[PDB]
Design an enzyme around this catalytic site. Structure first.
Site, PDB file in Angstrom:
ATOM      1  CB  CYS A 156      -0.939   0.003   1.206  1.00  0.00           C
ATOM      2  SG  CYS A 156      -2.136   1.351   1.204  1.00  0.00           S
ATOM      3  CG  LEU A 157       4.549   3.465  -1.602  1.00  0.00           C
ATOM      4  CD1 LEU A 157       4.618   4.162  -0.256  1.00  0.00           C
ATOM      5  CD2 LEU A 157       5.861   2.762  -1.908  1.00  0.00           C
TER       6      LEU A 157
END
Ligand SMILES: [Cl-]
Ligand code: NA
Ligand SMILES: [Zn+2]
Ligand SMILES: [Zn+2]
Lengths: 67, 147
Positions: free
Chosen positions: B81-82
């Site tokens: 999750c970036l």
């Protein structure tokens, strides 16, 4: 010595060179017409009359005239 | 797709000549991030998968952890999750970024987890309310799967 496109990292693309230069004096990244157009067209912040969008580097306003 | 090739031509050469410390990436692509000092992942070697989409660099790379890692922002499947891994407006990807920077971002994420953007709600809560317990678990997870 001459500078690669800030988007595709190449100097020559389809016989064109990165002659599309960022207005911002604190940036000045060069782009191919093709590359900058391909990026801006998908951006919601872009407008077209000639096309306006944001520099993919400095986020400042940039103008791209197609030919 | 001439732009995809020219990007990969220069990026791979640069990743081979002067890569980010603790980070390597070679031709699909394979990437490796060494566990940072003063992190629970220290002395751990983390393999990653780096898929370069057809519309690169107009689309972000697709990167998942092949090596299991215990982290608030990384699920069991290696999904990360970036923001720089997603397109605007929700994401933060742009052509000014590249494989080296995204990997550096992942490396930074490992050092400094984001509890506000959790993929693992359980791990995320532990990170906030029981840091030592989180550190202890991350260490063991690293010893078991990353070396
Ligand atoms: Cl590069
Ligand atoms: Na991605
Ligand atoms: Zn270009
Ligand atoms: Zn600029």
């Amino acid at each position: 010595f001459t500078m690669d496109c800030g988007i595709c990292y190449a100097y020559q693309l389809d016989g064109t060179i990165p002659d599309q230069v960022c207005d911002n004096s604190q940036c000045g990244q060069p782009f191919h017409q093709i590359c900058l157009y391909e990026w801006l067209r998908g951006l919601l912040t872009s407008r077209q009359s000639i096309i306006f969008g944001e520099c993919p580097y400095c986020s400042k306003p940039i103008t791209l005239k197609m030919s | 797709g001439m732009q995809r090739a020219s990007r990969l031509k220069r990026e791979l050469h640069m990743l081979a000549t002067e890569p980010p410390p603790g980070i390597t990436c070679w031709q699909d692509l394979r990437a490796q991030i060494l566990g940072g000092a003063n992190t629970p992942y220290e002395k751990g070697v983390f393999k990653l998968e780096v898929i370069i989409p057809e519309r690169y660099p107009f689309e972000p790379p697709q990167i998942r952890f092949l090596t299991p890692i215990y982290h608030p922002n990384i699920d069991s499947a290696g999904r990360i999750c970036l923001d720089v891994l997603k397109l605007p407006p929700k994401g933060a990807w742009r052509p000014s970024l590249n494989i080296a920077t995204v990997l550096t971002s992942i490396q930074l994420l490992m050092s400094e987890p984001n509890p506000d953007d959790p993929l693992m709600a359980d791990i995320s809560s532990e990170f906030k309310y029981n840091k030592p317990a989180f550190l202890k678990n991350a260490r063991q997870w690293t010893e078991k799967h990353a070396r």
